[PDB]
Write a protein that binds this ligand. Structure first.
Ligand code: FAD
Ligand code: FAD
Ligand code: F6T
Ligand code: F6T
Lengths: 540, 540
């Protein structure tokens, strides 16, 4: 569960995930997943090949530029470091499509010059003090799962870029059973954090799809959201305290009290900072007893529209289960094609978790509400296989890439009264833009509602196309994604619910938060990091 | 429910509340409240006189300095304004003890020079533009309920001080029944907001003790907390959107989505700004159906310690009702003395509110948990009279002042494992400090736990003494309150849970949030308001 230093030894150098986990054609000509790692690993998927065919119409290094005096002082600290090509290349990207192409099919313009692996807070203080002295530039990395060009090195950056890798600064420091909090180093992965806490009968319940690699410090940096937010909260709810190293000095509140009125909350100044202000070294997170019991479920609806109305009503009654998600028809068919009126029909997956008794009180209320929108209980299996699926979806990018298929997921949050219109108009905008740019086959564009809130919902989109017969396929993707974002904003959706801005969405930020607001962010950046040491150039 | 312009016509010029509501000795020599306004209004309180005697051992204008050219432009806007003494004196204070003495028994050093009453957002833009041009200073006021010297005018402030009164900028702009949000002007009072919304079947549930006068813009400015937070949230939870006028310009997010990842959340840059960055003019707040049903309750415990352990356990199981509060023994006796082992015994009051059916499921779980800490159901009456009492407590300051008794309430939040020790040591610190400073009778110092959180609790303290026979009684109070704050911090409590900092707690802020953090606040202030127009000098 700890990420090793030489990452390529466990993980794919050119795509998502673990080296031992890849999609291949088995000795029956059926798609199957390698290894023994996930539930679907080593399980043949007879309909999955047919589905890809039917849906898409297919068959089936720069040198290191580092000062020798800085390197001399760095050796005195016994902070491990590397100037090796394959380590620096690994830490120069996340998992946006364009990055993955330049990885497979060429080279990046700029990559980090040196990688450092601090192991504690004081190490990070040393590195930042060194960067002041020798005029260095720092780009923190945890899991490297950014889908916002958050880790990309600016091409015109003349200074030595340090990739400050947090993966080895990863121990749970204390578990406070009295206050139900856990004080942890920022580099720890979700999976490792949940595994260690479970041994003591606890958990956080913070479960992003990237949890195998994404870190505590990452989550704080990007305002990450988790699958079971309904119970455990998002990251802004979960974080009681943090310790941050910046060029100006160390930020840290002097007390651990649950809720304060001591001016503007400086946690929110860091939470969402996307690596531009400093290094988040330590954080105190809320824990809960390991849930007594879990149960899955599903509900089918005549159409998407009625499903949304039901989710709305569940939100209105504040009786949403741990996870509730509504798939459109194309996604329902997708999930059916992965097992070992039926064209508009939509399905909601459910996950209830908690105390044995309360879980059932909940379950009833949800199904009764669903009844009144034409919702019919559609089985415990549908639910369960739906959630196990989520940690393998990311591997399908690489599969599609073999067979001339490209695509990416994208998201927004919007008010309840804009959901239905937004989903419909964004999908339409994708079809139109594709046709106009010369795509031969109708592009796949689907959506699901992944989170409910009082004031609205999170909407998660997939879009993909067969790019065979297109002059410049990356420009087509790039331009269509940007069109979808324009449509999202025009239909009252947000710039991002949880992926954040990074460098992918910088152009919209001033509109989103206003000019004065943008300037507030800049004023902070310029106090904390006047000479731009933390110069990934995300956000501003 | 709307605050009029000439406030003194409905409200007390020299103390808390409505003119028609005062404690007096009735024609039987019993204490009674005037008027018909509260549940206890016109109800005689036979034991209350005896209690005050037993507990305490007693028997029972500067000229307006304003530019004529600015005044000329102001007349062109038809924004109402006043230079009258009694209007300016009214808006020069909140309800800290020292302010109330200077009001009754003398004069303030500095007061506002002119009062303005804008009626909308554009009016506020005009005023702030005028303050840039003629070098004016602005101190926003809503209810004037600050207990942090938040409204006090700095004595050495040479510029013309505008009291920007929000009371007339108070209309509900829309009610969005689809998104369950209400878009409101910042000057509306809680009481008026709840009344208007109830006519459409809705509420916010945000219920501070100051709700009769405190405003939406106030609550955002001070990070206000409400009695029924457990259901409805505190202000940071309730606010979906806001519009803020600052010298640099207008801040406002371009979309109304429920949850975002677009960098640091600029709402939290304003929320807690205590009138130092700008004027909050409009805000979008979460609403809920008017709760179907309410029920009160109470539980008695052998001691305070066991009550705290029970509240902790309720928090751990996340089954706290709308309100749960634990009184120490002195406060239990107090409440008993106001009706028309018993020395350590403590009592918890309960308020359950919601859907008819779910309220009872809750009720059972609370009492069963309480059973295991020696908690015996202690009646529906105790509960009900406990909560009706909270809106009359504030009127007792003025009663005590007649009979040589002074005192103030103060608060903190602390982790669960520091609650019991903090309460005991803070009370002890108050007795010791009082004795050392020459107080005749040991003072009253009591506490109650008013809110529970995952990571800790809010603790609410009263302290008071008979000041007869003391040279300088305001210095004694001042110095003791500051000693209590020292003791709070030393026992792991926070600088404030909900009253905020203002100018009362400025000296501790840098410790509380760290020096870099303090600088982050200052960096924002300086960008947004470079010439200190918003110069109440709270916080920094
Ligand atoms: C397959 C997949 C699934 C995903 N699922 C989800 C999901 O369910 N929910 C969700 O919110 N997001 C998701 N994401 C997006 C991403 O995982 C999150 O934004 C996550 O918070 C990033 O974690 P990380 O540790 O990989 O950070 P990185 O990708 O390593 O870095 C992200 C940014 O934060 C900065 N940073 C990292 N560590 C620190 C630190 N210690 N101090 C200061 N700055 C730092 C970096 O400089 C960079 O700008 C997913 C991404 C992928 C590829
Ligand atoms: C009897 C009593 C009971 C109380 N009970 C509670 C309670 O239960 N919970 C709680 O949290 N607090 C309580 N308070 C404290 C206080 O009422 C709150 O902090 C409240 O939020 C202040 O609201 P207001 O409209 O009275 O603001 P004011 O006192 O009028 O102003 C407070 C501060 O905010 C600024 N301000 C006001 N309006 C604006 C605006 N529109 N834009 C920008 N800045 C502005 C002012 O300049 C000032 O610094 C209580 C106080 C009293 C006297
Ligand atoms: C699933 C995406 C690839 C992708 O964008 N993966 C990243 C990812 C995967 C899962 C996520 N869950 C989130 O909340 N954010 C997430 C981000 C994809 C397609 F949408 C279409 C075709 C191939 C393909 F790989
Ligand atoms: C009730 C207080 C006066 C006081 O503290 N008023 C302000 C006040 C009153 C009620 C409050 N509820 C909160 O949450 N904050 C509050 C602040 C008081 C004393 F603490 C002691 C003697 C008389 C007296 F009136």
């Amino acid at each position: 569960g700890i990420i090793p230093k030489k990452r390529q030894e466990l993980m794919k150098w050119n795509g998502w995930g673990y080296n031992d986990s890849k999609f291949f054609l088995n000795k029956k000509g059926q798609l199957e997943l390698t290894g023994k790692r996930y539930p679907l690993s080593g399980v043949a998927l007879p309909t999955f090949k047919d589905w890809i065919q039917n849906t898409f119409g297919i068959n089936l290094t720069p040198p290191s530029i580092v000062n020798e005096d800085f390197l001399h002082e760095l050796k005195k600290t016994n902070i491990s470091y590397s100037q090796e090509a394959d380590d620096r290349v690994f830490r120069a990207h996340g998992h946006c499509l364009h990055e993955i192409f330049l990885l497979r099919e060429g080279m990046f313009e700029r990559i980090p010059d040196i990688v450092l692996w601090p192991t504690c807070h004081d190490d990070v203080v040393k590195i930042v003090n060194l960067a002041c002295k020798y005029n260095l530039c720092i780009i923190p990395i945890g899991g490297g799962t950014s889908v916002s060009y958050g880790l990309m090195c600016p091409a015109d950056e003349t200074r030595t870029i340090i990739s400050l890798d947090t993966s080895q600064m990863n121990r749970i420091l204390w578990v406070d059973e009295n206050n139900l909090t856990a004080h942890v180093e920022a580099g720890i992965t979700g999976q490792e954090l949940e595994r260690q806490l479970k041994e003591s009968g606890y958990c956080t319940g913070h479960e992003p799809d990237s949890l195998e690699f994404s870190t505590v410090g990452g989550w704080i940096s990007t305002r990450a959201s988790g699958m079971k937010k309904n119970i455990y909260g998002n990251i802004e709810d979960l974080v009681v305290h943090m310790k941050v190293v910046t060029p100006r000095g160390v930020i840290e509140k002097s007390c651990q009290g649950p809720r304060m009125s001591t001016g503007p909350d400086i946690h929110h100044f860091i939470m969402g900072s996307e690596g531009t202000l400093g290094v988040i070294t330590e954080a105190t997170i809320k824990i809960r007893p390991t849930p007594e019991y879990q149960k899955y479920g599903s509900v089918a609806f005549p159409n998407f529209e009625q499903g949304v109305a039901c989710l709305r009503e569940i939100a209105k009654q504040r009786c949403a289960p741990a996870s509730i998600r509504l798939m459109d028809n194309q996604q329902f068919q997708f999930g059916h094609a992965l097992k070992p009126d039926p064209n508009q029909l939509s399905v909601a997956t459910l996950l209830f978790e908690g105390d044995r008794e309360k879980v059932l009180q909940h379950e009833k209320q949800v199904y009764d509400i669903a009844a009144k929108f034409g919702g019919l209980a559609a089985g415990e299996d549908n639910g369960q296989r739906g959630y196990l699926l989520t940690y393998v979806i990311a591997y399908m990018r690489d599969l599609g890439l073999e067979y001339y298929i490209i695509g990416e997921s994208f998201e927004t949050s919007a008010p309840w009264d804009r959901v239905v219109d937004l989903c419909r108009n964004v999908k339409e905008r994708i079809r139109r833009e594709c046709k106009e740019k010369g795509v031969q086959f109708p592009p796949l564009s689907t959506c699901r509602v992944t989170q409910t809130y009082d004031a609205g919902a999170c909407i998660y989109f997939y879009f993909a196309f067969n790019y065979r017969g297109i002059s410049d396929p990356l420009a087509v993707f790039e331009q269509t994604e940007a069109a979808a974002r324009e449509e999202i904003l025009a239909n009252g959706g947000s710039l991002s619910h949880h992926h954040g801005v990074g460098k992918l969405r910088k152009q919209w930020l001033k509109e989103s938060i206003s000019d004065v607001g943008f300037g507030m962010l800049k004023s902070v950046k310029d106090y904390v990091d006047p000479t731009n040491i933390f110069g990934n150039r995300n956000l501003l």
